[PDB]
Design a protein around this motif. Structure first.
Motif, PDB file in Angstrom:
ATOM      1  N   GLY A 268       0.765  -1.233   0.000  1.00  0.00           N
ATOM      2  CA  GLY A 268       0.000   0.000   0.000  1.00  0.00           C
ATOM      3  C   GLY A 268       0.799   1.288   0.000  1.00  0.00           C
TER       4      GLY A 268
ATOM      5  N   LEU B 178      -2.509   4.880   5.245  1.00  0.00           N
ATOM      6  CA  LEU B 178      -2.753   4.243   3.956  1.00  0.00           C
ATOM      7  C   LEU B 178      -3.853   4.990   3.189  1.00  0.00           C
ATOM      8  CD1 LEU B 178      -2.206   1.662   2.173  1.00  0.00           C
ATOM      9  CD2 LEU B 178      -4.304   0.772   3.179  1.00  0.00           C
TER      10      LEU B 178
ATOM     11  N   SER C 135     -12.519   2.435   0.586  1.00  0.00           N
ATOM     12  CA  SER C 135     -13.326   2.467   1.809  1.00  0.00           C
ATOM     13  C   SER C 135     -13.602   3.910   2.219  1.00  0.00           C
ATOM     14  CB  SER C 135     -12.617   1.725   2.945  1.00  0.00           C
ATOM     15  OG  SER C 135     -11.447   2.410   3.350  1.00  0.00           O
TER      16      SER C 135
ATOM     17  N   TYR D  82     -13.282  -5.562   6.191  1.00  0.00           N
ATOM     18  CA  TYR D  82     -12.869  -5.430   4.797  1.00  0.00           C
ATOM     19  C   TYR D  82     -12.762  -6.836   4.222  1.00  0.00           C
ATOM     20  CZ  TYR D  82     -11.112  -0.920   6.623  1.00  0.00           C
ATOM     21  OH  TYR D  82     -10.955   0.306   7.228  1.00  0.00           O
TER      22      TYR D  82
ATOM     23  N   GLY E 260      -8.953  -7.888   6.027  1.00  0.00           N
ATOM     24  CA  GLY E 260      -9.049  -8.048   7.463  1.00  0.00           C
ATOM     25  C   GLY E 260     -10.119  -7.162   8.058  1.00  0.00           C
TER      26      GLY E 260
ATOM     27  N   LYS F  66      -5.611  -9.273  11.099  1.00  0.00           N
ATOM     28  CA  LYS F  66      -5.069  -9.336   9.746  1.00  0.00           C
ATOM     29  C   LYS F  66      -5.229  -8.016   8.992  1.00  0.00           C
ATOM     30  CE  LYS F  66      -5.953 -13.108   7.484  1.00  0.00           C
ATOM     31  NZ  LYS F  66      -6.856 -14.092   6.820  1.00  0.00           N
ATOM     32  N   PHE F  67      -5.268  -6.919   9.738  1.00  0.00           N
ATOM     33  CA  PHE F  67      -5.405  -5.595   9.142  1.00  0.00           C
ATOM     34  C   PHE F  67      -4.037  -4.951   8.956  1.00  0.00           C
ATOM     35  CE2 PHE F  67      -5.908  -0.930   9.771  1.00  0.00           C
ATOM     36  CZ  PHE F  67      -6.586  -0.664   8.585  1.00  0.00           C
TER      37      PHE F  67
ATOM     38  N   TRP G  15       2.904   1.901   7.913  1.00  0.00           N
ATOM     39  CA  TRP G  15       1.738   2.767   8.076  1.00  0.00           C
ATOM     40  C   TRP G  15       0.974   2.328   9.320  1.00  0.00           C
ATOM     41  CZ3 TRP G  15      -2.724  -0.124   7.671  1.00  0.00           C
ATOM     42  CH2 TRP G  15      -2.769  -1.188   6.751  1.00  0.00           C
TER      43      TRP G  15
ATOM     44  N   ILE H  63      -5.586   4.156   8.263  1.00  0.00           N
ATOM     45  CA  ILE H  63      -6.142   4.126   6.919  1.00  0.00           C
ATOM     46  C   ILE H  63      -7.045   5.331   6.671  1.00  0.00           C
ATOM     47  CG2 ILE H  63      -8.092   2.803   7.731  1.00  0.00           C
ATOM     48  CD1 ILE H  63      -8.025   1.367   4.934  1.00  0.00           C
TER      49      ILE H  63
ATOM     50  N   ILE I 253     -14.952  -1.518  -9.102  1.00  0.00           N
ATOM     51  CA  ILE I 253     -14.567  -0.335  -8.347  1.00  0.00           C
ATOM     52  C   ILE I 253     -13.091   0.000  -8.532  1.00  0.00           C
ATOM     53  CG2 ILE I 253     -16.273  -0.983  -6.610  1.00  0.00           C
ATOM     54  CD1 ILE I 253     -13.939  -1.689  -4.736  1.00  0.00           C
TER      55      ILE I 253
ATOM     56  N   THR J  19      -3.900  -4.200  -3.822  1.00  0.00           N
ATOM     57  CA  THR J  19      -2.800  -4.258  -4.781  1.00  0.00           C
ATOM     58  C   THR J  19      -3.170  -4.735  -6.179  1.00  0.00           C
ATOM     59  OG1 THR J  19      -1.272  -4.786  -2.960  1.00  0.00           O
ATOM     60  CG2 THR J  19      -0.463  -5.080  -5.209  1.00  0.00           C
TER      61      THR J  19
HETATM   62  C1  LIG Z   1      -2.715  -2.534   1.068  1.00  0.00           C
HETATM   63  C2  LIG Z   1      -2.221  -3.471  -0.038  1.00  0.00           C
HETATM   64  C3  LIG Z   1      -1.947  -4.896   0.485  1.00  0.00           C
HETATM   65  N1  LIG Z   1      -3.178  -5.713   0.672  1.00  0.00           N
HETATM   66  C4  LIG Z   1      -3.519  -6.244   2.010  1.00  0.00           C
HETATM   67  C5  LIG Z   1      -2.573  -7.388   2.437  1.00  0.00           C
HETATM   68  C6  LIG Z   1      -2.782  -8.660   1.601  1.00  0.00           C
HETATM   69  C7  LIG Z   1      -4.004  -6.022  -0.471  1.00  0.00           C
HETATM   70  O1  LIG Z   1      -3.554  -5.953  -1.603  1.00  0.00           O
HETATM   71  C8  LIG Z   1      -5.449  -6.456  -0.333  1.00  0.00           C
HETATM   72  C9  LIG Z   1      -5.867  -7.710  -0.864  1.00  0.00           C
HETATM   73  C10 LIG Z   1      -7.223  -8.130  -0.747  1.00  0.00           C
HETATM   74  C11 LIG Z   1      -7.660  -9.462  -1.314  1.00  0.00           C
HETATM   75  C12 LIG Z   1      -8.161  -7.285  -0.093  1.00  0.00           C
HETATM   76  C13 LIG Z   1      -7.748  -6.033   0.437  1.00  0.00           C
HETATM   77  C14 LIG Z   1      -8.710  -5.125   1.145  1.00  0.00           C
HETATM   78  O2  LIG Z   1      -9.674  -5.569   1.756  1.00  0.00           O
HETATM   79  N2  LIG Z   1      -8.422  -3.755   1.109  1.00  0.00           N
HETATM   80  C15 LIG Z   1      -9.199  -2.684   1.791  1.00  0.00           C
HETATM   81  C16 LIG Z   1      -8.124  -1.800   2.464  1.00  0.00           C
HETATM   82  C17 LIG Z   1      -7.264  -2.644   3.404  1.00  0.00           C
HETATM   83  C18 LIG Z   1      -7.857  -3.559   4.338  1.00  0.00           C
HETATM   84  C19 LIG Z   1      -7.048  -4.348   5.196  1.00  0.00           C
HETATM   85  F1  LIG Z   1      -7.612  -5.184   6.043  1.00  0.00           F
HETATM   86  C20 LIG Z   1      -5.636  -4.234   5.136  1.00  0.00           C
HETATM   87  C21 LIG Z   1      -5.044  -3.330   4.216  1.00  0.00           C
HETATM   88  F2  LIG Z   1      -3.743  -3.220   4.152  1.00  0.00           F
HETATM   89  C22 LIG Z   1      -5.856  -2.543   3.356  1.00  0.00           C
HETATM   90  C23 LIG Z   1     -10.134  -1.926   0.829  1.00  0.00           C
HETATM   91  O3  LIG Z   1     -10.797  -0.922   1.539  1.00  0.00           O
HETATM   92  C24 LIG Z   1     -11.217  -2.861   0.309  1.00  0.00           C
HETATM   93  N3  LIG Z   1     -12.149  -2.144  -0.549  1.00  0.00           N
HETATM   94  C25 LIG Z   1     -13.280  -2.983  -0.931  1.00  0.00           C
HETATM   95  C26 LIG Z   1     -14.132  -3.234   0.334  1.00  0.00           C
HETATM   96  C27 LIG Z   1     -14.604  -4.533   0.662  1.00  0.00           C
HETATM   97  C28 LIG Z   1     -15.368  -4.743   1.843  1.00  0.00           C
HETATM   98  C29 LIG Z   1     -15.670  -3.656   2.714  1.00  0.00           C
HETATM   99  C30 LIG Z   1     -15.209  -2.347   2.407  1.00  0.00           C
HETATM  100  I1  LIG Z   1     -15.643  -0.742   3.696  1.00  0.00           I
HETATM  101  C31 LIG Z   1     -14.444  -2.140   1.223  1.00  0.00           C
HETATM  102  C32 LIG Z   1      -6.390  -5.620   0.316  1.00  0.00           C
END
Ligand SMILES: CCCN(CCC)C(=O)c1cc(C)cc(C(=O)N[C@@H](Cc2cc(F)cc(F)c2)[C@H](O)CNCc2cccc(I)c2)c1
Length: 375
Positions: A16, A33, A38, A74, A77, A110-111, A118, A121, A222, A228
């Protein structure tokens, strides 16, 4: 669009992009971040194994408790926290300070990411998806209402022992013309909740996937900087991988690679980019029957981690997600005021000697309205 805002973003590949912000009085420095996926502004506010610093409400003279719990789940996490307001500033952003809602994170799962650097968020999307509900005004809305900053922001995310460091710029309140070349093409924000858009056609190396366009937005599509990879609905994902596999059939890779699990490496500097095809996503234009395309190079969907990479395209069960790897190489304008998202080739544009990322239009496409998922 200030020169003082250029290069105000940083991060590690796959972890991120974050911007420095201060919260409270005196100012407490935290890396946040930047997440267009979100709508909640949240910061670690209690010790955690992956946090080296966190928001301490007790040290802020301007902190006000809202006496309300909040929780956000999310895809990756989730976290739990306590709501309140306080003064917030962005040192390398507009020269203003606003009182914004802040979710103090007390529990998470797992957030936070080990080594990401960072601690919070910044949800830049709309109130409709904010928690607990849409009555909790998102940060950007507070910023626009409390200051004279125009209702728009733009992101220039740039590509690349430890993970490669990445950089970029978040231009708050405007468009910085030095960050892009060529023309800016706009796709409408279909609805103001996520930054929802509509994909009307998908090509792999000039070859049309030939699917009913509803499939490309199966459920929704979206623009998400907080994710990523380019995430695709099952049917679209399989068609895309099958096509990419065929284009690069010259070489064979384990299934773990295609599943974005294991990495693949080549002799330092020999990565055969030429065997990998370009991907073109055609986005609905501002005019009916008119679309434009953004073309992605393998340098974008093969993320750096001998030179090693991971396949940055994966299957989604909640719609298409145009993540950071898709945004990199393009200057993306989140024009909230005119409900549209613009794309232009970035100054740190996508590479290659025989190829290059592009944003081209117009391309006539009939019945684009029937490409969306109708509630
Ligand atoms: C930061 C880059 C590294 N990472 C994380 C480490 C693997 C990723 O690439 C990654 C991969 C996946 C499969 C899912 C997400 C993700 O959930 N991102 C949210 C921000 C966020 C969440 C968090 F838990 C960790 C994080 F680092 C970043 C984002 O908002 C989701 N938007 C759609 C949405 C859906 C439901 C509810 C709502 I409100 C919104 C990030």
């Amino acid at each position: 669009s200030f020169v003082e805002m250029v290069d105000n973003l940083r991060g590690k590949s796959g972890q991120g992009y974050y911007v420095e912000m201060t919260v409270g009085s005196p100012p407490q420095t935290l890396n946040i971040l930047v997440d267009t996926g979100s709508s909640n502004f949240a910061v670690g506010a209690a010790p955690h194994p992956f946090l080296h610093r966190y928001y301490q409400r007790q040290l802020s003279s301007t902190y006000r408790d809202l006496r309300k719990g909040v929780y956000v789940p999310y895809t990756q996490g989730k976290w739990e926290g306590e709501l309140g307001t306080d003064l917030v500033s962005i040192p390398h952003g507009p020269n203003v300070t606003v009182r914004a809602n802040i979710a103090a994170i007390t529990e998470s799962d797992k957030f936070f990411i080990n080594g990401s650097n960072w601690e919070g968020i910044l949800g830049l999307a709309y109130a409709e998806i904010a928690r607990p509900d849409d009555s909790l005004e998102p940060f950007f809305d507070s910023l626009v209402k409390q200051t004279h900053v125009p209702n728009l922001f733009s992101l220039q995310l740039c590509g690349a022992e430890v993970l490669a460091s990445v950089g970029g710029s978040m231009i708050i309140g405007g468009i910085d013309h030095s960050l892009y070349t060529g023309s800016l093409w706009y796709t409408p924000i279909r609805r103001e909740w996520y930054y929802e858009v509509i994909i009307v056609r998908v090509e792999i190396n000039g070859q049309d996937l030939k699917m009913d366009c509803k499939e490309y937005n199966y459920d929704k599509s979206i623009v998400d900087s907080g994710t990523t990879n380019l995430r695709l609905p099952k049917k679209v994902f399989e068609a895309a991988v099958k096509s990419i596999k065929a284009a690069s059939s010259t070489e064979k890779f384990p299934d773990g690679f295609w599943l974005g699990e294991q990495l693949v490496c080549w002799q330092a500097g020999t990565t055969p980019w030429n065997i990998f095809p370009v991907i073109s996503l055609y986005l609905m234009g501002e005019v009916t029957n008119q679309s434009f395309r953004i073309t992605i190079l393998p340098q974008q969907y093969l993320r750096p981690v001998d030179d090693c990479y991971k396949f940055a395209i994966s299957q989604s069960s909640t719609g298409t997600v145009m993540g950071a790897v898709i945004m990199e190489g393009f200057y993306v304008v989140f024009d909230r005021a005119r409900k549209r998202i613009g794309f232009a080739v970035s100054a740190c544009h996508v590479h290659d000697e025989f190829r290059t990322a592009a944003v081209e239009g117009p391309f006539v496409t009939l019945d684009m309205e029937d490409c969306g998922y109708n509630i």
